């Protein structure tokens, strides 16, 4: 068999605004979740409200 052609457009994908925002939102939400836990941990340890 012939080696796979890298330029074959059938093996290429186009990331539109949808997928582009999805990964961006996923990263930002992950940071938001981490911040939420840090506040929870800080409140318990420092004895705040």
């Amino acid at each position: 068999k012939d080696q796979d052609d890298r330029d074959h457009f059938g093996k290429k994908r186009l990331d539109l605004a949808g997928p582009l925002l999805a990964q961006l939102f996923k990263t930002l939400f992950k940071k938001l979740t981490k911040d939420i836990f840090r506040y929870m941990q800080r409140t318990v340890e420092e004895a705040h409200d």
Binding site: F37, Q41, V44, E45
Partner: peptide, 9 residues
Amino acid sequence: LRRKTRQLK
């Protein structure tokens, strides 16, 4: 002792 604070996945 322990850290008195941990997260469970």
